[PDB]
Write a protein that binds this ligand. Sequence first.
Ligand SMILES: CCc1nc2c(C)cc(C)nc2n1[C@H]1CCc2cc(-c3ccccc3-c3nnn[nH]3)ccc21
Length: 251
Amino acid sequence: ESADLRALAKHLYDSYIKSFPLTKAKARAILTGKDKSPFVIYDMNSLMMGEDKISKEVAIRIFQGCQFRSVEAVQEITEYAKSIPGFVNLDLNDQVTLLKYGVHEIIYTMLASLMNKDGVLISEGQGFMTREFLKSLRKPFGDFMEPKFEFAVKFNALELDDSDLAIFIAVIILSGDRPGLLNVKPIEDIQDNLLQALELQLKLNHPESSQLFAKLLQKMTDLRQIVTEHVQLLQVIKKTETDMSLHPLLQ
Ligand SMILES: CCc1nc2c(C)cc(C)nc2n1[C@H]1CCc2cc(-c3ccccc3-c3nnn[nH]3)ccc21
């Protein structure tokens, strides 16, 4: 029944609110003037101003900020995954596998919520770092954030809300195509139910947006590429800057 799928949509929406302290709605209210206005970092000079509001050099301090935020996201996505009906019933190794790979794709989906064509919200929405400033960082650093902005600009064109994102990120975690997956079928049965709920949710929430379901699934291609490029750049920094490496979770 469709009434059963509506209950799954509400349950995923509630768990998303409980797990993610910074929603798209909060982020959009900050970015549009509705919630307090953020301090804008567009300069190396303006960066020093935001430090007393509220690692050696600028590009390195920003990089460790990204790594710190990545860990928090891993923690919050892990907490959310436990609530997906069927997730915790799966084999211990599979749970770990679905998270190990699925986490990178969720991070970039949810990071789009904090972005517009000209910048990104930082420090729990208190700040706003411009696209131009991030791009101007000394190489190889001033390269990593640019494709996330590229995906965000196009991903935000879908005009999704938090209730759509809750179901969409559930689909990501439950993908039966991960390396080292022992029992593929139980994962696919969960995903089938999730996709059914996502389909209904998009038809009810965006009734005028023709083929948004087909449009949303195609975006999974864009995610996989940004992950590859991120891992590729992560190796460069690991060899050039033999300093601070990945956090236990980040490893
Ligand atoms: C919400 C911010 C965020 N979450 C990220 C996740 C999940 C993944 C990746 C790859 N990057 C992430 N970022 C980037 C965007 C630009 C920026 C600036 C900073 C930053 C720069 C200078 C000073 C402070 C901060 C800061 N600290 N805490 N939040 N922002 C830290 C992080 C980041």
